[PDB]
Structure formats: structure tokens, C-alpha cells
Amino acid sequence: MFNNEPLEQIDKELHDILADEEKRQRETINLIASENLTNGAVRECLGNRVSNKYSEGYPKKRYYGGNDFIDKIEELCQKRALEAFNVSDEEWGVNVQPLSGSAANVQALYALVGVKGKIMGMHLCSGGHLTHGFFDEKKKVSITSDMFESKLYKCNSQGYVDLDAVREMALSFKPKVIICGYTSYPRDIDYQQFRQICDEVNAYLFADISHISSFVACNILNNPFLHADVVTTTTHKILRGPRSALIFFNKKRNPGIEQKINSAVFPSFQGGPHNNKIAAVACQLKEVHSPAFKEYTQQVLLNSKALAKALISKQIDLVTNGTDNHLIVVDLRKFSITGSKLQETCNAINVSLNKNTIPSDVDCVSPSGVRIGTPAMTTRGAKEKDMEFIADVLARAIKITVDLQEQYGKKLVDFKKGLPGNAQLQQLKQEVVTWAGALPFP
Amino acid sequence: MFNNEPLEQIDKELHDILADEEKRQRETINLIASENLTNGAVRECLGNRVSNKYSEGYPKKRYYGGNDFIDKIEELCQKRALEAFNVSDEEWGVNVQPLSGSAANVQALYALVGVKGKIMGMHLCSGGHLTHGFFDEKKKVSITSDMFESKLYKCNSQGYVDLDAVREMALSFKPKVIICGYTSYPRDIDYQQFRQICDEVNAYLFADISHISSFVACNILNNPFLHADVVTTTTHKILRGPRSALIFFNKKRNPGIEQKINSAVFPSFQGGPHNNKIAAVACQLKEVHSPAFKEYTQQVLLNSKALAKALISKQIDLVTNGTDNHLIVVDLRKFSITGSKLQETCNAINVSLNKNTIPSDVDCVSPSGVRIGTPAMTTRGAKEKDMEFIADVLARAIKITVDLQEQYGKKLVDFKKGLPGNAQLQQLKQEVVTWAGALPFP
Ligand SMILES: *Cc1c(COP(=O)(O)O)cnc(C)c1O
Ligand SMILES: *Cc1c(COP(=O)(O)O)cnc(C)c1O
């Protein structure tokens, strides 16, 4: 007693929009540093019947029965998680149930400090995440500043973490948790010098490596697992998994932490795990451990290096003047345009990127930069030689943005009206669509 | 630069477990009242490439661009949502982003009351959900008792919501939110009477209709939308959608509540939405509003009535001596066995049900009942005539549990040793598998 008709039949209208979205994805140069494209296998798992099953609790300790094949899956996922990140059963545990990077952070932070607890994180405009305790002056924008009492540190004017300001603010504030690892940081992190600050004040060290997880896994960047009490990471983004998250916790450094994290996730916050998510994570953490994935991660970094260099060779400025990772923040002050306007121009040419603050920005409104990243295009098979074209496309986009701003004004509302119809944009778009359209697409 | 090989090939190990789980689901009489089986179309959406896309924010008001087709999906889903539950655009709003029923309740409650806010809900052992403010004498088990100040009401010894106890507790405690709608309540709810209690205290009325959502949509049970300020429902369970949740809010009764709910979800709690979830919710809500779905919901109620009746006809006691909905709680005291034990016996015979407390249980350990429901089996095509067999199977399961208990003792560990290699159970299991196995299976 159900309708078994395929999606095309059963809901034509939704099948059409979904087909368009796929075409868009396929025909776009995607530079969103936090996006990627999952393979077909991951998507078979996300659509598996395993999500019919309710599984509140943990393996061997479920509320309900019938959970034997489910337990093997969660078990496999924890196994594959701890090894991908080169840690041992006996030092580190992992929770694979958090539904999102934001959930994992909220849960992990609750487990460590509880309500009213004190936390330190990097400011949003400076490149920290919302769930790192973000607030405005007026109101607590993130639960992490309301459930918790949070203070925010900034980066210096060169766009580097001001470790000395981290110490100044910590000693005065005495947080129980200091969060590092960011949303928009083009340089690797000094986890050791964070480990020293926490130790100095008896704080937990929290590394959110969501943006760079693959570099940590692949031994290409610094290892927070030698210094952190807790590491969180999304499974999507550069890891190229489904939409989910992982909480790692150092048993050796804090016995009794395993209980605090496992019970914070459920029953404090979540209900039943989403087992399709867990299956898909398992499926990608296998891939993550294969040496072809290390190749891919290396290709990501090469492309990023090549992208930065090509942009510099076209006299475009980058925050910190380069990158150690997959992402580049462009400083646009030189051209008297906002990242705000450039996003609009690139949207108009099937190029995906987003506005981003730069150190000199006092507010988060009308920011002076854009963030770009190479994980998605690398997945699509672009190599170092392809970065010049992307850089070329971006420079042309910056130039057209300058031309349209002089013709239509600095007012963002007014700027947009210039975009539609523009022959330069249409030609550049078609250039993009023609190159993007035919690239490998999972 | 990715692996395109199918799941069977790319990860044989996971594929075999998943295949086993599909066979378990198929060969089980599944009476878990909160479970169902999604159709293929819902599962094409869960594995759609739409989940590649980051969509922080709401339609027309996203952080990033490239979001036109995503915006059309979220808008469709909210539209199909508001009509399914027969409410007008102009009186009711919905948020389709919450990832789980539990997140919806945490997010919805935070929007209404804020940290330290006062809430009232039904106790867990009485059938209220964890996210209704559950705590123990020792621990704040759910975030909803720690983040908020919560008080828990109970049902009377007949298993009915004790409205007089609700008013009492509400006047003494003055909450800002009173939650009703439950996890394990076999009867319909008097929302008008809750609405009156909330008015005398100026509290919000919160209806979590996750278990009975389809009865509300199809106009078979009472309509909470006539009285409630806020209604939450999972999209899974009886609604038979994917794993996700909805928050409905009454604009007409509460000005400026729309932004309170929309902002608590994001950016207070969640990050990007999971667009595959929103897609799938849209696809099922289309179904919900179709006349075939009302038929199904009617078959669910018919089946429950027949199962209740056939259980009574075999001298088995039911809490409230029947049901108005999809679920029955069996009282086992008459047989001197625990729900705990019966769950084990039914596990051993491919029958899924769960232990449940009854009013006379003061412990939530070693409870005296079991909860059963008809949504999953109705989906699989069982009709009223088939409930006899299921009642017959449960009666026989109770008897074997009786026999095994006095042969092995009343201690849980001792009891379980009797299950393996018991000829009666293997025979009964065989009968179950044979009947379940050939039933229609999405
Ligand atoms: C993207 C991100 C998150 C949140 O991930 P979601 O799954 O989108 O909630 C958390 N922390 C960091 C550093 C991130 O980059
Ligand atoms: C099952 C349930 C929930 C939570 O649903 P999840 O998706 O498992 O978080 C919330 N409220 C009620 C009444 C429920 O039955």
C-alpha cells in the first residue's frame, strides 16, 4: 500500500528542478572553498533503506533490538574514521552520529564545558565559524555565545592568527575551551603553540579541521591530533563525504571524556542516528584512506598554489600573500570594488565564489575580499595548467566589475542592474559553460 | 579525479551488510510504532546531487549565489507543507530546515523562551519525548532540561493525560511553553483544554504531532492547528517521509514569531540545510495531500483498531483499554513478565516492538509494557484480517516468554540464555519470516 512510481513519474515538477540543478552544477566553475562533489557510491548509501531503522543509543547498547546489521555499520565507520586520521583505538575515540559540523561543535562544546561555560574562538569576520561562539554587539547570533559565555579573538593586519593576542585574552578570561581551525584561513595552524596556551590556563584544546581535514589525514599539513583534546570535522567539504560530522576525543589525555561526548550527542541533543549518513561516511572514509585519495589531496594543494601564483602574476593581492592549503582570500581594495559586487559578477558568469572579510574590514557589511578554493574543480579533473584560465576568468571578472561600477555606481542595488544583457558577461559565461560543461562530473 | 565504481564494486564489505539489513527489514513483522518504509522516489531524492550545494540562509535571502533552483525546492516544500496540514499562507508559516524532530523541538523552544526559559512537558516514562524537558533526579538527561528550566507532568493511573494536574502545575510554576503531543500515547489529545490552560498563564501552546501527523493532515484526529502557537512534526514515522522535521508557527496569533523561529534554526543552531532532505520532504508531502494517502492513513487506524480488538479477544490488557490512533501499549502485569523480556522474545522471532512503561511503573527500568504500532505493516499491505495473525503471534510470544521465565528465572541475563536453540521460537520465527518475506516491500 504505497506509490512505487519513479521520481520522474511520481513528481515530474520536482524532477525538473533537480535536473536543472544538476545541469547548473555541471556547467559551473565552482570555487566555493567548502563545496565538493560526492561520488555515485556515497549517493547510493544516502538513498539506502538503512534509514528506515531507528537506532537510538550506541553499538551493543541500543534502546531497541533488530539493530545488528546497523551496529556493524556504525562500528565499521568508527574503525575507518580513526585510521583515516592515523590515530589508535586506545588513545582516541570517535562519535560518528553528529548530523552536521555545527551540531558536532555544539555537542562537543557542551560535553566539555556545559551551559554557562567559557569558550574562546576566532571572530567570524576574521574567519572563525558561527559555532565558535559568534555574537554581534546587540544579540547572541550563535547558540554558542548564548548557551556559553564566549570571547572572540582576531587575526592581525597581515591576516595571521595573533597568538600573542590569544594569550593576552586567555590569561585574562580563563576559558575552559579554546577553539582553533577555521572557515576562511589560507595558512596552516600552529597547534603546538595553542596547546601551550591552553596548558598555561588549564583549557581544553579544540581543533575544528572541517576545511582542511584531508590535509590532516594525508599528512600534508600540521597534525592537531598530537596536541588536541578534541578534534571535530565535517565529512563533506574537502573530505568529499556526505553531509555529516565527526567528533574525535583524546582518551589518554582525559579519561571519562568518552562518556561526556557520547551522551552530549545523544540523549542531550540528538535522537536516532541517521544511518544512511553513517553508511555514506563509512563509504568515503574507505576512499579517504586509499593512496589515490592522497593523490587527489595533493592535486588540490598544487592547484591552489598554481592558482595563487597566476593571480599574483596578474597583480591581484591575496591575504597573507599566498596559501598553505586549498583556499585563497583575495584582497580587492586595489580595485575599489567589494567582494560583495564580485560575487554578483561571478554569479552572472557561472563562477561560484563568495564574499569574505579582510583584516582591514571593520564591519562584516560590504567586505573587501572573496574566498576561493580548489577542492571541487580538482574533483572535476582540473590540473595546474587549468588554474591560469580560472585566474584569467577571475581577472576579467574583476575588470568588468570595475567597468560596471563606474557606469552604474557604488550602490549595490544600482550595480546589479548593469549585469543582465552585458555582452562581455554573456561571452565570458559561454566561455565558462563550454569549459565547465565538459569536465569530468561524478 | 574521483572513483566512479558502483557501491557493490567500490566497497563490497559495506554493500553486503546493507544487503543483509534490506533482507532483515523484509523478513520482519515490524511493529515499532515510530518506523516506516520510504518509497523509491523519496530515496532517489535523498541520494540526489542537490546535497552538493551550500544554502545557508533562506530563499531569496541566501548567503551565497547559485541558489535559484535550491530556492525553488525549499519554496515548493514549504508550500506543499502548509497545504498538507490544511493551513493558509497568511496565518501559518513553516520552517523545513530542521534535521530531526529533536532539533526542531530544541530550536522551536529556544526561539520561544530562550536560555533559562520555563517549559512544561510530559514525563518520559509517561510518554513524553526526551526534548520535552526530560531530566532525572541525578542528571539533566536532555538539553531541554539544562538549557531550559523544565517541569514534567504525568498521566493518571488509567493512562490518560491528567489535565487537572497540568493546570495545577502550570499555575504553581508559570511556564512560558506547555508541550503536548507524545511518543507513546494511545489516545487523541484535547488541545482545546491545553489552550485554555496556556491562556490562564500566558504560556505558549506547543503541539508535537510527530507520531500522529498523518491523522492530523488527513483530518482523522483532532486538529492542533486550531489551538497551537507552534506545531512540530517529524517527516518520517507515520508521515512516511525522510528523516527530517517541520516547525509550523501561527503568524496571526504571534507577530514577529516568524523571524524568531527562522533565526533559532539558522544561524543559532544549524549551518547549511541538507537540500537532499528538503527535496525528499517535498516529494512526500505531495503524496500526503493525495487521496491514496488518506486511504493509507485510514488503513493504519483500521489496522490498529483490529489489532487492539483481537488482542483484547485473547485476554491481553491494553493501557486505556484501546487506542484512537496507530499505537497500542500492552500491559503485561497479568503475566508476570516485563516488556523488557518480551522485546527479547520478539527479537528472537523477527518481530520488532519495544518495551514501554505503564502508569504503575515508577522505574523506567524493567518496564511492564510494550508499545506496538501499525504504520510499517500497513505500508507493507496488511489489512484488518491480518491483525489476527499478529495478535496470535504476540499471544504465543507472551506464552513462550512465560514458559522461559520460570524455566530460567526472572533475572534478565538468566532469561536471555533460554532464547537461542528454543524449538518453539525457531518454528514461530519461521512462520513470521514466511509471512513477512512475501509482503509488498518498497
Ligand atoms: C562548514 C563548517 C562548519 C559547519 O558545518 P555544517 O555541516 O555546514 O554545519 C563548522 N566549522 C567549520 C570550520 C566549518 O568550515
Ligand atoms: C520521534 C520523536 C521525536 C524526535 O524525532 P527524531 O527525528 O528521532 O529526532 C520528537 N518528538 C516526538 C513526539 C517523537 O515521537
Residue numbers in the entry:
A (entry chain B), B (entry chain A): 1 to 442
The study reports:
Furthermore, as in P. falciparum SHMT, a redox switch created from a cysteine pair (Cys125–Cys364) was observed. A previous study revealed that the THF-dependent activity of PfSHMT is regulated by the redox status of a cysteine pair. Switching of enzyme activity based on the redox environment was also observed for PvSHMT.
SHMT is a pyridoxal-5′-phosphate (PLP)-dependent enzyme that catalyzes the interconversion of l-serine (l-Ser) and tetrahydro­folate (THF) to glycine (Gly) and methylene tetrahydrofolate (MTHF). The enzyme provides activated one-carbon units for the synthesis of dTMP, choline and amino acids. Plasmodium serine hydroxymethyltransferase (SHMT) has recently been shown to be vital for parasite growth and development, making it a potential target for antimalarial drug development. The overall structure of PvSHMT was found to be very similar to that of PfSHMT, existing as a twofold symmetric homodimer with two catalytic sites.
